[PDB]
Homo-oligomer: A and B are copies of this chain.
Amino acid sequence: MTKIALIGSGQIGAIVGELCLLENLGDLILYDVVPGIPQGKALDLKHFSTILGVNRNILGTNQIEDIKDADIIVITAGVQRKEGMTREDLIGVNGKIMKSVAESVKLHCSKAFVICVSNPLDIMVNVFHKFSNLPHEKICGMAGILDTSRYCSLIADKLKVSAEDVNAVILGGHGDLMVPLQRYTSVNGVPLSEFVKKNMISQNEIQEIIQKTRNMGAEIIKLAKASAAFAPAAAITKMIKSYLYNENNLFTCAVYLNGHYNCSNLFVGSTAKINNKGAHPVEFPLTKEEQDLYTESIASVQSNTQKAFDLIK
């Protein structure tokens, strides 16, 4: 009975649709502006479903009114960046697209939970909130689960441990101003600081890893000639799951801050829980230095958001 609407049928959207089918999360509605594309991917997904013994319904469509009564909305519509570009270079063209999608969600399914993925991520979440007229808890963006996966992955490789239970908090905008928190990094519970004391990893090695984490999105673009699609989709699917199954998992994602971390009235990457009712920020006690870094990331997001609202007229 659950309806999952993918607004954008590109790489990310299709794989999200594929992952949703694998766990039987819901019926799919594959929407795109370009005719034929969602219908074709829907056909390929049905044949996939038939081989793997999944039976959920899959509808490829160019009529955005088919998004009606979606329980979940994943928004990937928009352009992606190429080599040499920053995420922020998409601000002009994607803001306009995000506004249009916001206006459509507003009239067709105002009760949905909305996961935004168009870049630049934090900014585009703010745009969606402005024109959608949905409650702020019902809107979020994925990024932090992606950036955390890259940072944990690298930490795991340097410590010669499984990535499976390397956990971390990354605060701030999905960009060059991310703030990975060493204090809030653990390896199956054990703080990262223990592994520095045991000489298994050095402060310099960690700064190196933080740098690779920041650039990773660009590095994949450079190597693969396309932007990361599998990891983003997995992250998204994890956030859909936490909503549908009322799991109340504690992630980083772009969420409405409201007095938390000295910030108010802005969607930005932060610690949050996701459950039945949406995405709910949680404030943890930062050090002065940590908070100072975070606030600096928050300032860019503020600026670039305003820039976006301006460029939309």
Contacts and interface: CB of A to CB of B under 8 A. Distances in A.
Interface residues of A, number: 58
B18 A153 contact: no
Contacts of A221: 40
| Stoichiometry, copies per complex | 4
B43 A223 contact: yes
Given A44-B228, A85-B89, A92-B82, A55 B220 contact: no
Contact of A44 (B50, B52, B92, B230): B230
Contacts of A55: 162-164
Given A22-B22, A45-B230, A313-B82, A50 B152 contact: yes
Interface stretch (A109-117, A142-150, A255-263, A276-284): A142-150
A39 B223 contact: yes
A47 interface: yes
Interface of A: 14-15, 18, 22, 36-37, 39-41, 43-53, 55, 60, 79, 82, 84-85, 89, 92-93, 145-146, 149-150, 152-153, 156, 162-164, 166, 216, 219-226, 228-231, 233-235, 238, 313
